[PDB]
Ligand SMILES: O=C(CCC1CCCC1)N1CCNCC1
């Protein structure tokens with residue numbers, strides 16, 4: 102089997118991408134944030150505290166003929182941005198792009214933090230990191246990808262995010278029309294449960310490539326590119342007037358600037374992030390200070406190749422017995 106679904110930016114900045122997901126019988130379609138950096142599938146629901154719902158579409162398990170309470174199971178997640186959600190668990194039929202999993206754990210939120218309430222476009226998350234990070238207790242649950250894997254034509258999914266445009270998530274096949282040149286594969290450690298790999302270095306604009314090992318996670322759930330402070334300083338030093346602002350919480354730059362590209366290594370291959378991808382616009386409406394799309398990972402504990410980096414590539418998440426990542430230019 103295979104599946105193919107379009108993923109769409111939630112706003113003009115590509116702050117997050119949503120993908121339609123069918124849950125239950127008859128189908129209830131929710132727009133979920135696919136997250137290669139976490140391993141829970143959780144939704145706004147008929148159980149979510151009413152004051153914490155503001156415009157999201159909710160899953161109502163009592164309207165699904167295939168929904169079953171997973172008796173005794175609860176979940177609770179705390180994200181790095183300080184947001185959180187928690188609740189109970191149903192099993193139900195879940196389909197993504199025509200690929201159907203029966204018996205998927207659907208984590209129904211009873212509580213969500215303010216960042217989730219305030220984002221009316223995101224009805225929940227769908228996790229695609231390894232199932233070892235799933236938060237369901239007392240019986241950990243599998244991700245949609247892990248449940249689908251045995252049925253798939255190939256044990257892979259691919260992320261092809263757009264810059265200010267829709268893109269695609271495919272399951273079970275590699276669309277050889279969706280990239281240019283060849284795919285470079287690189288090793289993945291599952292030791293922390295993330296898709297964790299090691300970039301071979303970087304360049305800023307037309308500068309020389311610096312060979313240096315950079316360990317991080319391929320995370321579709323993350324908007325920006327988080328790298329070591331040395332690398333980030335080297336990038337922003339090439340932008341007149343850029344500075345790190347403790348008031349704003351990262352690097353900002355004059356909205357009049359033209360940003361240089363950023364290149365990251367994948368083995369002997371190179372992925373080039375165009376400068377425009379690194380512009381996240383005014384810090385507040387009407388400001389002439391703009392927020393940078395490359396930020397320091399100092400205080401995170403890990404480098405994050407988020408959407409700014411991933412959207413410059415066709416990315417293969419190879420879930421074979423020995424997992425690997427693949428990157429191609431596009
Ligand atoms: O990119 C982030 C936060 C990144 C943080 C960096 C360190 C911990 C996580 N998003 C995506 C859009 N929704 C809000 C959260």
Ligand SMILES: O=C(CCC1CCCC1)N1CCNCC1
Nearest residue numbers: 138139178180181234320322323
């Ligand atoms: O903060 C995290 C990890 C969340 C935890 C990992 C396992 C349990 C939840 N991020 C940054 C945003 N994208 C997802 C990865």
